[PDB]
Amino acid sequence: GEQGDIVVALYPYDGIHPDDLSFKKGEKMKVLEEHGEWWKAKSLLTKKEGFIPSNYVAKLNTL
Numbered sequence: 001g002e003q004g005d006i007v008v009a010l011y012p013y014d015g016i017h018p019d020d021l022s023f024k025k026g027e028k029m030k031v032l033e034e035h036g037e038w039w040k041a042k043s044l045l046t047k048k049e050g051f052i053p054s055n056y057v058a059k060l061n062t063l
């Protein structure tokens with residue numbers, strides 16, 4: 001549902017591997033592709049790409 005859309009981190013996360021994106025609570029990311037539990041994303045702040053745990057983020061356009 002979120003490919004191409006903007007999510008915000010609910011919780012911070014420090015990457016443990018090079019393919020992970022590290023982020024802070026409140027950081028905005030574009031979802032590049034969903035792959036189940038982990039999504040590939042781009043930080044709108046740093047422009048870096050990597051995988052993120054989807055249960056750390058929520059859609060920015062919430063009701």
Ligand SMILES: [Cl-]
Pocket residue numbers: 015020021022023048
């Ligand atoms: Cl990073």
Ligand SMILES: [Cl-]
Pocket residue numbers: 026027028044045
């Ligand atoms: Cl940000």
